[PDB]
Amino acid sequence: MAEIGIFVGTMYGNSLLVAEEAEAILTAQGHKATVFEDPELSDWLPYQDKYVLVVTSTTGQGDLPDSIVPLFQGIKDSLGFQPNLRYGVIALGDSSYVNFCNGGKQFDALLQEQSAQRVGEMLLIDASENPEPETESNPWVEHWGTLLS
Structure with a gap:
């Protein structure tokens, strides 16, 4: 049984979902997953x-x-x-922009700029094609969740 900190980052503060889904899927798979709203680095350090x-x-x-x-x-x-860190990631937005889902890809580069590791490959959601991001990220967390312990 591993521990997963889920840290949510979207411009709109209301009606967030995929974080609570990801926590709940990883919990349903049998890992101790938790959501963090308005993320602190004092909450990531653990x-x-x-x-x-x-x-x-x-x-x-x-x-x-x-x-x-x-x-x-x-x-x-x-x-x-970073001595022992690994993580996963779910980027979202509109593929009409040149750099589509770069917000989560920036987080991947961040860990690689230090020394930290990766788990599975990240989710990228296009709102131009799928305005229901839980329909993409939920089965993604259900696949990626199998990478945890």
Whole structure:
């Protein structure tokens, strides 16, 4: 039984879902998963020797929302070296933008800029084709969840 911190990062603060889905799927599979709203790096530091999940929409023109900015910067500057870390990730947005789902791909690069590891391959949701992100990310968490312990 592993421990998964799920850290949510979207420009709209209301009506979030896929984080609570991901927590619940990973819990249903048998792993101790938990959601963090308005993410602190003081809440990510507990998972340096554990697993983590990044759930983040609103990539826009290739940028992060202010809800997950301080986490992103806090990993790259306040962690800066990582001994045993692994994580998974679910990016979302509109593929009409050049860089589609770069908000979660930035989080992947972050761990690789230090020394940290990856679990499965990330989800990328296109709202232009699927405005129901739980229909994509839920079975993704149900597949990716099999990578945990």
